[PDB]
Design a binder for this molecule. Structure first.
Ligand SMILES: [Zn+2]
Lengths: 38, 29
């Protein structure tokens, strides 16, 4: 019953270490104006 | 309390830095 089904995320592990190192979308910012701790 | 595995499974990645973007949640205090 549904043998070929990618349940667990593939990037999970990859994104796992990435998250640990807080290496996520570090894209720029559009007018901060105080507030929003980054 | 709420599971923190769902969002991860359906996580997205930006198309600029090739990194995994984080959708707005609200707070965490
Ligand atoms: Zn980005």
């Amino acid at each position: 019953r549904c043998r070929h089904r990618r349940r667990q995320a593939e990037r999970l592990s990859q994104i796992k270490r990435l998250l640990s190192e807080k290496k996520t979308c570090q894209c720029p910012h559009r007018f901060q104006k105080t507030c929003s701790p980054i | 309390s709420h599971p923190e595995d769902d969002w991860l499974e359906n996580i997205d990645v930006c198309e600029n830095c090739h990194y995994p973007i984080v959708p707005l949640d609200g707070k965490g205090t």
